[PDB]
Amino acid sequence: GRDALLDQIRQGIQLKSVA
Amino acid sequence: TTALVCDNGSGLVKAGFAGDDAPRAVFPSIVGRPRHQGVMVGMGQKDSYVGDEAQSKRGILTLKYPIEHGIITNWDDMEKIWHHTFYNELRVAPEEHPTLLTEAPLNPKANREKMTQIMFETFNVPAMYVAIQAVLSLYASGRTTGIVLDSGDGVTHNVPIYEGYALPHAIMRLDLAGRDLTDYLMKILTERGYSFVTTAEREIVRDIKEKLCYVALDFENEMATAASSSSLEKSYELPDGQVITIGNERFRCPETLFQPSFIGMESAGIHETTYNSIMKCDIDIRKDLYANNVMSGGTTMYPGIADRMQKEITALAPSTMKIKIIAPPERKYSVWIGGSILASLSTFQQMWITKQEYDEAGPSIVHRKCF
Numbered sequence: 001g002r003d004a005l006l007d008q009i010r011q012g013i014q015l016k017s018v019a
Numbered sequence: 020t021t022a023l024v025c026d027n028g029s030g031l032v033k034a035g036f037a038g039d040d041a042p043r044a045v046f047p048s049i050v051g052r053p054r055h056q057g058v059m060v061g062m063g064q065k066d067s068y069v070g071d072e073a074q075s076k077r078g079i080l081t082l083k084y085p086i087e088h089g090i091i092t093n094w095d096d097m098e099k100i101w102h103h104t105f106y107n108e109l110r111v112a113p114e115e116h117p118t119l120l121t122e123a124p125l126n127p128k129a130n131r132e133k134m135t136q137i138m139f140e141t142f143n144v145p146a147m148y149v150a151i152q153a154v155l156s157l158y159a160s161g162r163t164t165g166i167v168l169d170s171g172d173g174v175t176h177n178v179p180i181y182e183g184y185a186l187p188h189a190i191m192r193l194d195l196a197g198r199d200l201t202d203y204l205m206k207i208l209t210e211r212g213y214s215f216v217t218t219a220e221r222e223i224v225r226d227i228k229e230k231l232c233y234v235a236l237d238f239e240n241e242m243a244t245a246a247s248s249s250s251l252e253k254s255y256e257l258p259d260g261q262v263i264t265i266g267n268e269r270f271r272c273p274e275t276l277f278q279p280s281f282i283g284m285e286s287a288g289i290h291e292t293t294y295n296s297i298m299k300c301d302i303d304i305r306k307d308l309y310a311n312n313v314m315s316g317g318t319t320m321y322p323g324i325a326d327r328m329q330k331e332i333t334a335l336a337p338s339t340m341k342i343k344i345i346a347p348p349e350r351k352y353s354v355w356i357g358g359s360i361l362a363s364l365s366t367f368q369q370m371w372i373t374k375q376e377y378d379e380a381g382p383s384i385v386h387r388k389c390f
């Protein structure tokens with residue numbers, strides 16, 4: 001089930017800003 | 020209940036919390052110890068100093084770099100960095116934070132394990148992981164395939180990657196990067212007449228470099244045009260109101276990456292070392308690589324390096340080939356971002372190495388979990 005790990009790295013995420 | 024991401028640079032430690040868009044702290048990967056006893060007296064019982072705190076207190080100290088060319092070498096000093104990081108930079112308790120670490124490409128089996136050990140046994144983390152400094156950079160751009168050019172302060176690595184794994188058989192290293200460049204910049208400036216000796220002027224040639232340097236498309240053109248008309252000059256003001264002026268030194272400094280012959284390196288020019296790699300690969304895939312060339316690391320920040328990589332990897336590859344150089348604006352904190360990203364993933368939780376997993380299998384576990 002690592003394939004879904006790239007399925008994700010591809011799709012993306014939303015990192016919280018700072019400062 | 021959040022995780023920690025620490026990115027080891029042989030020049031800078033970049034650490035922060037997973038889930039955030041940039042390292043909260045970044046500092047000098049150094050360890051300063053008193054040159055002799057007379058310096059320990061007033062110490063007030065503390066042993067060493069680290070990062071910026073080890074800078075300003077230079078004379079009394081003996082600085083050492085725990086990381087050489089990317090690979091950790093002075094362990095006990097890497098243990099002192101890590102500490103300072105966790106407690107002094109992030110202000111967190113290792114013991115209660117998962118932690119994503121980065122290993123340079125071709126990280127030694129032992130270095131991988133040694134590092135593991137220290138994290139769980141010395142720092143007692145709840146769980147931790149290790150990622151190849153390069154792969155993250157790629158991931159940070161949303162790619163699970165491509166060939167990454169990691170160029171920091173100490174080392175320059177060319178990395179090909181298919182469906183997640185790197186291809187250690189096609190890894191191309193180059194012991195020429197930042198420090199070196201900054202340093203040449205000096206040689207060429209000194210030749211110019213200026214005088215950069217003190218350790219202070221060194222940090223001046225770095226700032227200088229950092230802010231007035233780029234990568235020419237047609238070198239001998241910009242070279243010829245640089246000495247025929249003053250049109251390409253710029254001037255820099257030092258701390259005491261004194262001004263210097265950088266001539267062609269502007270692109271003669273970064274030119275090295277493409278011409279290691281400058282500083283005396285029989286090694287191949289990065290442009291080449293990049294081609295040379297896409298070639299060490301299975302015929303049917305390079306196709307994708309040639310197109311997904313992605314850059315990371317402080318030294319690939321020189322402007323016009325992408326516009327120059329095109330120019331070269333292009334002319335070396337097939338007439339029909341399609342090349343596309345991916346150079347992200349924050350290509351500096353690329354590596355770190357990856358780890359952040361990686362760690363904030365759901366499909367990733369199931370992949371950490373837990374304190375309790377480390378106790379029945381030992382540290383040789385690094386090879387079965389971190390692929």
Ligand SMILES: Nc1ncnc2c1ncn2[C@@H]1O[C@H](COP(=O)(O)OP(=O)(O)OP(=O)(O)O)[C@@H](O)[C@H]1O
Binds near residue numbers: 171198318
């Ligand atoms: N805009 C810029 N142009 C050129 N060089 C730059 C720029 N910004 C930073 N640098 C140089 O990048 C280097 C730092 O790069 P990076 O942060 O990738 O290094 P690192 O991780 O410490 O090294 P390594 O890859 O050996 O671990 C320094 O030499 C720094 O002066």
Ligand SMILES: [Ca+2]
Binds near residue numbers: 152
């Ligand atoms: Ca690095």
